[PDB]
Each structure stands twice: as C-alpha cells, then as structure tokens.
C-alpha cells in the first residue's frame, strides 16, 4: 500500500495472506468470507504472461496476521487449500477481466478477535454504496512505492466515476471492474500497489454498521500516479458465480 498507515490490531480481521511455500514468499492478499472459503484475485494464482501457475500444493493461506514477516504465536491460523477455483471467463490476455478466484480450505478455521468474515453485498447494498465519491478501504502487505512494509497497511480511497476511469488508461475497462483514488487536485493521495492484489476493497454500511467487500485489488499502472487510479474486481457483478461455486462445492 502506498501512502497508507499501520492497521490497528483486528481492524481488518477478514484480511488473508497468500503464502508461497518454496521459496517462502508473500504472493498476494486475500479475504475471508466464511469459515471455509477465501476470496482473491485470479491473476495471483494464474498469469501466463509472467509464467505464473500455482495450485493447491504450492500455497499456504495465513489468517489473523498483522506482522508481514514474523510468525504470530496463538494469533494467526494457517490453512491449506483443498481446491482453487479461477473464474472461467478470466481474461489474463487483455485486461484481467473477471480477475477473481475462490479457494476452499481443507480445515475450517475458528473465529477470534483477529479472524472474522466480511460480508458480501446484495443488490441494493451494492446499488446504494458503490457510488462516485464514496470512500472505501484497501488493505494489504504490498509495496510502499512503485516496498516491503513490516505490518499490514491501510488506506481509504474514493470510488471514481467510469468516464474518469476509462479516460485514465488505454486498457479496455469493463463493468466487472471499478476504479478508486484521489484525483490530481485533491491534496490527499494513496493507492494499492504490486503485492496488494487479492486484498478487499471494503465499505461500512451506514445502514447496519457492517463491512461489505465491494472490491478486489486487481491492477493499475504504477502506483499513486496523478491521473491514474487503481482498479478493483467488481465483487457484486460476480456475486452469482460466487454463490454458484459455494453451493456446488
């Protein structure tokens, strides 16, 4: 995260870290949505253009963490993936469309002060909250500049209207993606960066004081550039696939 700040303990208890086994490495952010299911960006697991292919064996899911590097005794839980599920219409070729993947864990996790599921939006939750000017919250352990923070970072960014998104990049935008960040003339800044992918863009419902994941960190061009905005998988637009996959498996 660029131009963010240390997360307080338990401020983002759904935050998950995707951990490569060999070599031991942080790959990506993810998020907890139930005791058994975790959500992340497709490109984290599969990106041929950089020769990226990870399956169940290659990966660990770490939950309840705050310190990036250190093991956290009696705070953090570690799970292994039973089955990954990339979205079938995920376009790694052009524009990372439907950059989303689900992961079912072998063993369900016990909840605690530090590990707790986020809500996924419904029709109206999306409708009312996903709107130009409303700020959301991005978290992760990615890069502090176009990096390596010691502790989970946090930043709040305003959702941006489509026209400004589309006109900010020559990459073809879709409606499975939204963009967020401060405009050039706003004095505040901040962005996700390389390493933050898979992390949630969350919003607090003023209706029921609950947190909803509206977004997944997907991409951008550099980090924290005036005129550029980070892009997020539109979680709701893909809600049906999510429910679909949960129901079945």
């Amino acid at each position: 995260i660029v131009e963010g700040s240390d997360a307080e303990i338990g401020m983002s208890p759904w935050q998950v870290m995707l951990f490569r086994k060999s070599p031991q490495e942080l790959l990506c952010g993810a998020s907890l949505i139930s005791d058994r299911w975790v959500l992340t960006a497709a490109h984290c697991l599969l990106y041929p253009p950089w020769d990226k292919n990870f399956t169940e064996n290659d990966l660990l899911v770490r939950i309840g963490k705050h310190s990036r590097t250190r093991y956290e005794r009696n705070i953090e839980k570690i799970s292994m993936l039973e089955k990954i599920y990339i979205h079938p219409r995920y376009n790694w070729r052009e524009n990372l469309d439907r950059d989303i993947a689900l992961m079912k864990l072998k063993k369900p996790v016990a909840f605690s002060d530090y590990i707790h599921p986020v809500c996924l939006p419904d029709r109206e939750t999306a409708a009312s909250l996903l709107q130009a000017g409303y700020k959301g919250r991005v978290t992760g352990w990615g890069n502090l500049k176009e990096g390596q923070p010691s502790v989970l970072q946090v930043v709040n960014l305003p959702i941006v209207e489509r026209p400004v998104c589309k006109d900010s990049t020559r990459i073809r935008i879709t409606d499975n993606m939204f963009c967020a960040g401060y405009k050039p003339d706003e004095g505040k800044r901040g962005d996700a960066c390389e390493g933050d992918s898979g992390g949630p863009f969350v919003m607090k419902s003023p209706f029921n004081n609950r947190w909803y994941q509206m977004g997944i960190v997907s991409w951008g061009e550099g980090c924290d550039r005036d005129g550029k905005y980070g892009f997020y998988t539109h979680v709701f637009r893909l809600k049906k696939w999510i429910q679909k996959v949960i129901d079945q498996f």
Binding site: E8, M11, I33, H116, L120, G133, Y134, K135
Partner: peptide
C-alpha cells in the same frame, strides 16, 4: 450471519481511527 462485525471494534462499540472518514464520505 455474523459477518462484517469486528470483535475488537463494532462488537465492543469502539471505532477505528479512520472509519469516520468513510461514513462522512456519504454526505
């Protein structure tokens, strides 16, 4: 059905340093 309420925050009526920025944005 317990989702989205933080044990150390909402569940204890405490607020994090910045959540006020979010709610305030909805004006």
């Amino acid at each position: 059905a317990d989702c989205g309420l933080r044990p150390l925050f909402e569940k204890k009526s405490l607020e994090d340093k910045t959540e006020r920025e979010l709610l305030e944005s909805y004006i």
